[PDB]
Amino acid sequence: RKPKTGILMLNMGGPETLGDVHDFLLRLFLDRDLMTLPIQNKLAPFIAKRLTPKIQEQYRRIGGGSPIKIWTSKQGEGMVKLLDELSPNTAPHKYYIGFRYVHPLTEEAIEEMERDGLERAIAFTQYPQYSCSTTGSSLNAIYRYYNQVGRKPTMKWSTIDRWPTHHLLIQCFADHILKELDHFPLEKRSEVVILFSAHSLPMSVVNRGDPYPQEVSATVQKVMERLEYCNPYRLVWQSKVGPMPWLGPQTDESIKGLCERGRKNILLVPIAFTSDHIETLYELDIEYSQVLAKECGVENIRRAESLNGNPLFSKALADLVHSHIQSNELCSKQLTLSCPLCVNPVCRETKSFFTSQQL
Amino acid sequence: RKPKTGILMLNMGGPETLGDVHDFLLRLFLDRDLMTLPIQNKLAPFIAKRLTPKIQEQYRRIGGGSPIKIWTSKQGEGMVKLLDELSPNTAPHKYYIGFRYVHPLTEEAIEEMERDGLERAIAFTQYPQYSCSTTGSSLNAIYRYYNQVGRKPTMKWSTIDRWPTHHLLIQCFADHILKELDHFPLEKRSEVVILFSAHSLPMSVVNRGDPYPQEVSATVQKVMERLEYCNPYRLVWQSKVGPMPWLGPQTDESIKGLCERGRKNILLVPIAFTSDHIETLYELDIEYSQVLAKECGVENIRRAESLNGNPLFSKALADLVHSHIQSNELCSKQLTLSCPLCVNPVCRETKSFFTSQQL
Ligand SMILES: C[C@H](CCC(=O)O)[C@H]1CC[C@H]2[C@@H]3[C@H](O)C[C@@H]4C[C@H](O)CC[C@]4(C)[C@H]3C[C@H](O)[C@]12C
Ligand SMILES: C[C@H](CCC(=O)O)[C@H]1CC[C@H]2[C@@H]3[C@H](O)C[C@@H]4C[C@H](O)CC[C@]4(C)[C@H]3C[C@H](O)[C@]12C
Ligand SMILES: C[C@H](CCC(=O)O)[C@H]1CC[C@H]2[C@@H]3[C@H](O)C[C@@H]4C[C@H](O)CC[C@]4(C)[C@H]3C[C@H](O)[C@]12C
Ligand SMILES: C[C@H](CCC(=O)O)[C@H]1CC[C@H]2[C@@H]3[C@H](O)C[C@@H]4C[C@H](O)CC[C@]4(C)[C@H]3C[C@H](O)[C@]12C
Ligand SMILES: C[C@H](CCC(=O)O)[C@H]1CC[C@H]2[C@@H]3[C@H](O)C[C@@H]4C[C@H](O)CC[C@]4(C)[C@H]3C[C@H](O)[C@]12C
Ligand SMILES: C[C@H](CCC(=O)O)[C@H]1CC[C@H]2[C@@H]3[C@H](O)C[C@@H]4C[C@H](O)CC[C@]4(C)[C@H]3C[C@H](O)[C@]12C
Ligand code: FES
Ligand code: FES
């Protein structure tokens, strides 16, 4: 039986091997919906080349590459299995991976979906909280693909552009937090302080109206409510780079600050991504938990396991797609409102691309 | 007959008459928990004096004074009426107003509570979302009062230091939003965009770990979920002053940005305060809705009514106090975690003041 419904799982992606690092960075630095550089066509390949060594080294430190594709595939397989049972009327379902900067690229996925002659296509962002820089960028790629190929889609499109508080997503986070709290010495469990950590954004992006911070904040509240506020927490942000102002507090500075103030039992909780990747395996685990934490004299610092292959997470994914199909939703109401200070003309085109879809 | 349980309603307060502006500002610039200034004892009176004219003018523009005490009193009376019926075991209940910078001052309220021979005293912040600059400052005042008076309290203390997602608070906001949406022309109701607006914070405060942004964001999500995402929204921030970086987007820039982008039907929703005051009556209503909006060519801009005298809000207050009493809570779990980068030694003292209370 030929595939009827395709679920395009969108994510930035990460290099699978050290050899993929260079092109990963190149594609990224060439992206306008994310970055404007002078003589970009020249500096893009240059900056990619100069950062490759350091980035390859980071991936070497975690085993030689990014596990994003492996986890995405496992989740997609689980999701599809459930969807075929949940929604027989839209089966067979097939998942496609559309990474923004690595293979399979968004464009390659769309080309295959079209080639497979699907009746329906769902742009399912793998980022629970919407940022014009993450989900937005992936959605722009879809609009741009058809605009560039100079032809209309042969499939009916729609998008699940955000899902910051999906009940099953929240349950997964809560479950992983609880099981990690169990790993702390019993005598320190109640003393543990939780630092929810999400990739930060430059203040210039936050100030334009990016939906991200508020949604990430919503996820945190939902998780803590489910945990019945068993431990105190703080939502902090990681991955800042460069000298420019970014949304803080910074995860690293917070870890150090807590230790200096007597809170030496910390539980890190990646709250804005669903699989392991450089942010968790390198930045949180090595950079902060092994090096920084040791230098600050932490007693116990752990990190909640990433959702990865948790069966309940695959259930969450299937539930989202199923509910989306049943509601005939073309996109969230939120997507119909671009940032108040958006200056990228493509955002409105992308929005319209989805709001105007037939069906 | 004699009062048994006192509910101290904490809020910054506002000058009741133009004549009260000067001392309001003086007390404020003399608060080390709010800000630290060089030679503060000399600069406070000086700054208060220089700002008085402009601030008096703002209050003149809204009628001649702040309605905060009037609304606070009405809510307090309604709250007490309900509490006497809800919690007979802790009745008679008495509410006391503890304004940070205007009469009745926090210190004056405490003196009266002590004098009334209360058995229980509850520091009930009127800010649903915790900021060390709002609720924290108020709680610090309580600790400082006893530390300064050189005497221990004669009543049992506890605090309701935050309540960002209390179901009745959320219902009130949603109700007021729905009725304001009904005031827009029917043909534009669906086109209306919601701007949740809350007093901004300097990035220096946000970056040290202030709980505020994340909690305000939680309130927004709960309200939108209750409204079933009927309209698109954005959480923006108002009241920024000075040349330093503050958390954006700015409410004023967002209003202008939306209009320039074709979204000329806006609903402003104060989401971090429960009564009318300078932020709503002047900043939003006059500064932004009457002047700015007009200059931007807005079609319709309205503001959800503040909670003020809504009976359901008095119920929310009573329910919070009731649940607090029945739970025997001394404070939220959140108060037990000071900011990761807190540099104010009084914060820990204040925290301990409550966590260490007998009972
Ligand atoms: C100016 C521009 C940022 C523009 C902006 O966002 O306003 C920045 C982004 C990355 C920068 C480049 C990268 O840092 C790589 C190089 C760093 C060297 O120190 C200067 C040249 C160098 C090639 C930089 C030139 C310039 O300062 C760039 C291109
Ligand atoms: C800052 C920007 C998001 C901006 C926005 O909020 O719109 C994010 C998106 C992808 C990020 C980049 C990618 O993760 C790839 C690189 C990862 C390195 O660890 C830092 C540089 C690096 C080049 C990152 C810089 C920055 O954090 C980027 C560019
Ligand atoms: C750190 C890295 C340059 C590394 C190098 O010179 O080797 C530079 C290259 C392009 C930069 C990014 C681009 O200038 C686009 C964004 C500009 C904002 O002011 C900060 C975030 C922002 C996302 C920058 C983050 C960071 O400074 C980047 C990623
Ligand atoms: C330097 C200090 C801020 C210190 C800090 O945050 O680290 C700021 C806070 C308020 C400022 C003062 C207030 O703005 C009032 C005055 C404004 C005048 O333009 C300069 C003198 C003036 C008296 C300022 C001096 C100085 O710049 C102050 C005292
Ligand atoms: C910025 C600060 C909160 C700081 C923090 O996040 O810790 C808030 C608390 C009370 C505010 C002040 C009070 O509202 C009184 C004044 C109101 C005027 O409209 C601006 C100046 C004014 C003097 C305000 C400046 C600033 O917005 C203050 C000082
Ligand atoms: C604007 C006002 C001075 C007005 C005047 O003298 O004309 C100054 C006096 C003290 C200032 C505040 C204090 O310096 C404390 C805070 C310092 C932060 O860098 C900005 C917020 C912050 C809360 C300042 C806001 C604003 O710039 C204030 C309130
Ligand atoms: S930058 Fe957010 S919609 Fe364009
Ligand atoms: S400044 Fe937040 S706890 Fe001290």
- Nearest residue CA, atom 4 of ligand 8? B342
A211 contacts on B by Cβ (under 8 Å): 234
Transcribe B250-263 into DSSP letters: BHHHHHHHHHHTT-
Evaluate the omega torsion of the peptide bond into residue A243 and state whether it is cis, within 30 degrees of 0: no
Instruction: Quote the CA–CA distance of A183 and B331 in Å, as a whole number.
Output: 27
A263 contacts on B by Cβ (under 8 Å): 337, 340
CA proximity to A165, closest of A119, A117, A220, A104: A220
- Ranges of beta strands (E only) in chain B are 5-11, 93-99, 120-125, 156-160, 193-199, 233-238, 265-270, 300-303
CA proximity to A234, closest of A195, A260, A178: A195
Instruction: Quote the CA–CA distance of B92 and B4 in Å, as a whole number.
Output: 5
CA proximity to B216, closest of B200, B205, B203: B200
Q: Report CA(B198)–ligand 3 centroid distance (Å).
A: 31
Instruction: Quote the CA–CA distance of B157 and B137 in Å, as a whole number.
Output: 17
Looking at all shown ligands, the one closest to residue A34's CA atom is 2
CA proximity to B207, closest of A82, A335, A235: A235
CA proximity to B342, closest of B330, B331, B333, B351: B351
Q: For this structure, is B199 an active site residue?
A: no
For chain B, give every domain's residue range: 1-163+307-359, 164-306
Residue type at A155?
M
Residue A211 carries which DSSP code? S
Q: Contacts from A294-298 at CB under 8 Å and sequence distance 24+?
A: A296/A255, A296/A256, A296/A259, A296/A260, A297/A259, A297/A264, A298/A255, A298/A259, A298/A264, A298/A265, A298/A266
CA distances, B179 to each of A52, A201, B172, B173, B235 (Å): 56, 35, 11, 10, 20
Instruction: Quote the CA–CA distance of B110 and B146 in Å, as a whole number.
Output: 9
Transcribe B35-72 into DSSP letters: ---TTHHHHHHHHHHHHHHHHHHHHHHTTSS--HHHHH
Instruction: Quote the CA–CA distance of B343 and A167 in Å, as a whole number.
Output: 37
Buried b (16+ CB within 10 A) or exposed e, B56-73: bebbeebeebbbbbebbe
**Helices assigned H by DSSP within chain A:** 21-29, 40-61, 68-86, 106-115, 135-149, 167-181, 203-206, 212-226, 251-260, 278, 293-295, 311-327, 346-355
Looking at all shown ligands, the one closest to residue B342's CA atom is 8
Instruction: Quote the CA–CA distance of B88 and A244 in Å, as a whole number.
Output: 57
Buried b (16+ CB within 10 A) or exposed e, A41-71: eeebbebbeebbeebbebbeebeebbbbbeb
Instruction: Quote the CA–CA distance of B8 and A151 in Å, as a whole number.
Output: 66
Instruction: Quote the CA–CA distance of B305 and B234 in Å, as a whole number.
Output: 18
Q: Are the beta carbons of B226 and B169 closer than 8 angstroms?
A: no
Transcribe A257-314 into DSSP letters: HHHHTT--EEEEEE-S-SS--HIIIIIIIIIIIIIIHHHTT-SEEEEPPPSTT-HHHH
Q: Are the beta carbons of A8 and A121 closer than 8 angstroms?
A: yes
Q: Are the beta carbons of A264 and A300 closer than 8 angstroms?
A: yes
Q: Would you call B238 helix, strand, or coil by DSSP?
A: strand
Mutate to test the interface with B, among A221, A224, A332 (most CBs of B within 10 A): A221
Instruction: Quote the CA–CA distance of B114 and B98 in Å, as a whole number.
Output: 13
Contact state of B261 with A342 under an 8 Å Cβ cutoff: yes
Contact state of B232 with A334 under an 8 Å Cβ cutoff: yes
Q: Are the beta carbons of B176 and B310 closer than 8 angstroms?
A: yes
Looking at all shown ligands, the one closest to residue B22's CA atom is 5
B205 contacts on A by Cβ (under 8 Å): none
The residues facing B238 across adjacent strands are B199
Tell the CATH topology of A1-163+307-359. Answer: Rossmann fold (3.40.50)
Provide the shortest C-alpha distance from residue A16 to chain B (in Å): 34
Q: Report CA(B269)–ligand 8 centroid distance (Å).
A: 27
Element (H, E) at A236: strand A233-238
Same fold, B1-163+307-359 and B164-306: yes
Tell me the two tokens of residue B220: 């927004």
Instruction: Quote the CA–CA distance of A254 and B340 in Å, as a whole number.
Output: 5
Q: Are the beta carbons of B75 and B311 closer than 8 angstroms?
A: no
Q: Report CA(A359)–ligand 2 centroid distance (Å).
A: 36
Q: Report CA(A244)–ligand 4 centroid distance (Å).
A: 24
B334 contacts on A by Cβ (under 8 Å): 229, 232-233
Q: What is the strand order of the sheet B5-11 is part of?
A: B93-99, B5-11, B120-125, B156-160
Q: Would you call A14 helix, strand, or coil by DSSP?
A: coil
Give the residue numbers of A annotated as catalytic, written as ranges: 166, 319
- With a 6 A CB cut-off, is A206 part of the ligand 7 pocket? no
Ligand 1 atom having least distance to the Cα of A35: 6
Residue A218 carries which DSSP code? H
Q: How far is CA A226 from the centre of its chain?
A: 22
Instruction: Quote the CA–CA distance of B357 and A290 in Å, as a whole number.
Output: 38
Element (H, E) at A330: none
Instruction: Quote the CA–CA distance of B122 and B111 in Å, as a whole number.
Output: 14
Instruction: Quote the CA–CA distance of B281 and B278 in Å, as a whole number.
Output: 5
Mutate to test the interface with A, among B237, B250, B327, B333 (most CBs of A within 10 A): B333
- With a 6 A CB cut-off, is B36 part of the ligand 4 pocket? no
CA proximity to B192, closest of B180, B210, B204: B180
| Beta carbons within 10 angstroms of residue B42's beta carbon | 10
- Nearest residue CA, atom 3 of ligand 7? A338
Beta-carbon contacts of residue A291 (< 8 Å; ≥ 6 apart): none
A164-306 in CATH: which number?
3.40.50.1400
CA proximity to A275, closest of A313, A327, A237: A313
Instruction: Quote the CA–CA distance of B63 and B286 in Å, as a whole number.
Output: 12
Instruction: Quote the CA–CA distance of A295 and A259 in Å, as a whole number.
Output: 10
Contact state of B214 with A203 under an 8 Å Cβ cutoff: no
Q: Would you call A124 helix, strand, or coil by DSSP?
A: strand
Contact state of A254 with B336 under an 8 Å Cβ cutoff: no
- Which of A203, A235, A337 has its CB closest to that of B245? A203
Tell me the two tokens of residue A11: 């994510």
Element (H, E) at B345: helix B345-355
Mutate to test the interface with A, among B201, B221, B222 (most CBs of A within 10 A): B221
Instruction: Quote the CA–CA distance of A176 and B316 in Å, as a whole number.
Output: 33
Tell me, in Å, the resolution of the deposited structure.
Answer: 2.0
- Which of B193, B221, B247 has its CB closest to that of A337? B193
Contact state of B231 with A332 under an 8 Å Cβ cutoff: no
A342 contacts on B by Cβ (under 8 Å): 257, 261
Angle at A344 between CA A33 and CA A8, to 5 degrees: 50
Tell me the two tokens of residue B118: 């209360």
Buried b (16+ CB within 10 A) or exposed e, B198-223: bbbbbbebbbbbbbbbbbbbbbbbbb
Count of residues in chain A? 359
Buried b (16+ CB within 10 A) or exposed e, A98-132: bbbbbbbbbbebbebbbeeebebbbbbbbbbbbbb
CA proximity to A287, closest of A61, A66, A54, A18: A61
Looking at all shown ligands, the one closest to residue A206's CA atom is 2
Nearest CA in chain B to A232: B334
Cα Rg of chain A, angstroms: 20
Q: In chain B, what is the greatest distance between 2 CA atoms, to the nearest angstrom?
A: 64
Nearest CA in chain B to A258: B340
Provide the shortest C-alpha distance from residue A234 to chain B (in Å): 7
Tell me the two tokens of residue A79: 């999701």
Q: Report CA(B349)–ligand 8 centroid distance (Å).
A: 11
Nearest CA in chain B to A228: B333
CA proximity to A7, closest of A166, A120, A85, A101: A120
* A167, A172, A177, A178: CA torsion to nearest 10: 90
Q: Would you call A89 helix, strand, or coil by DSSP?
A: helix
Provide the shortest C-alpha distance from residue A232 to chain B (in Å): 5
Instruction: Quote the CA–CA distance of B292 and B296 in Å, as a whole number.
Output: 6
Burial class of B230 by CB neighbour count within 10 A (0 to 12, 13 to 18, 19+): middle
Half-sphere exposure (CA, 13 Å, Cβ side) for B48?
21
Instruction: Quote the CA–CA distance of B216 and A68 in Å, as a whole number.
Output: 33
Q: Are the beta carbons of A296 and A255 closer than 8 angstroms?
A: yes
Q: Would you call A232 helix, strand, or coil by DSSP?
A: coil
Q: Are the beta carbons of A22 and A28 closer than 8 angstroms?
A: no
Instruction: Quote the CA–CA distance of A183 and B58 in Å, as a whole number.
Output: 57
